[PDB]
Amino acid sequence: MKNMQRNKQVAMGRKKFNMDPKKGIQFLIENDLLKNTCEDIAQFLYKGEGLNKTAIGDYLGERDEFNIQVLHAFVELHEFTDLNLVQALRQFLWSFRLPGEAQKIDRMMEAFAQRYCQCNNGVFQSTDTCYVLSFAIIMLNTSLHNPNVKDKPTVERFIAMNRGINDGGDLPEELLRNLYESIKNEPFKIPELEHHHHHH
Template sequence: ISVPEDLSLEEREELLDIRRRKKELIDDIERLKYEIAEVMTEIDNLTSVEESKTTQRNKQIAMGRKKFNMDPKKGIQFLIENDLLQSSPEDVAQFLYKGEGLNKTVIGDYLGERDEFNIKVLQAFVELHEFADLNLVQALRQFLWSFRLPGEAQKIDRMMEAFAARYCLCNPGVFQSTGGRVKTWKRRWFILTDNCLYYFEYTTDKEPRGIIPLENLSIREVEDPRKPNCFELYNPSHKGQVIKACKTEADGRVVEGNHVVYRISAPSPEEKEEWMKSIRASISRDPFYDMLATRKRRIANKK
């Protein structure tokens, strides 16, 4: 390294020292560049690994959904075995509720199974729905949007029972009804489905206390001095005839009802109108029943 001759000895040593430190700094910078390059390479590799894992996971989830749509139990088992789904009823219910890529008909079949685990999944699935402040038609429409009802009657019964319990829990406002020989008002929870009116004594009941088929009945608004927002079911063709219905006694026996009319008091005028509209839409006519009732009345009159 050349040094100007006009510098003093002290200045020459200082210049050499500066040049030496400069070289050390350049070497340090190059070393840091190399280390940074190595770190960036490692980061890129880690990112690629994570992306690969994510891609693999997504592929497995997609495979699990396909398996579920072909065989729901095998699909759930595949997802659990590959740590893509927890084995609790709550996690399985959440997976079905989200429904991404799942066949809604298959979801309905799986939820309707009578296995203990499936029943727990159904319960957890229903609890994911919020029915507060919805009328029955709105709540049922929301519930049925998340799956398709299966074709088996027993499966439908289990699912509708779970729905009814959840709906009653979310809507503590209930009807009161009267009828029969002793005119006393009783608090009841009602479910309208399949052209029948089911009523329950408690929200936790799995079986209805009574069933009123709406066939050949009519509905009308009535005034009652003891209760507001009243309407009643009656037989328009055969005045005074007991309505075809059944109820469960305290000892568990199922007996025929003895009501000539069913008078019901709704919690509010709005709910009264909504229920009357829904019940009216569910009423069906059966000419054979009219003919049979007329024949029975004639026989009774002859006696």
């Protein structure tokens, strides 16, 4: 029952963000409860233990000066080390909103695979494949289930892109069918989704 010091901090921390973003952080970083220099700021700011989505978002998806460092710091806090490339490109652009559309995701992707490689390390050749491939899928899903991009690509086409972008990786065909399956079978993606608006 005796409320531990740490617990008391975690609570007050969430409150800050609720009133204003970057407040809960400065607290832990000011009280030594956290490690500044974009070290721990990643494991926390990136998500935290109940941080306001609107807050973390405003900090992730704009520009700033220090923020850019927080993102580059650690690129593996999207809970998908054992999930898969595609599956990651499905649900990983919410809780913040990416205003502008296809334009910033490019850079964010280069660094995405550049650090996320840890998830596999050797599976996607090195890193280039992980990046170039990632986008290939982001487009697939989009064109797949989109009103402004009514196309509905096929698994074959993907393989057509993989068999060349890999630069030698090749990647099992069966894997391409499963990785792409996560999409066709589990549509939806970047913000501004239908999310079943018909609900009257």
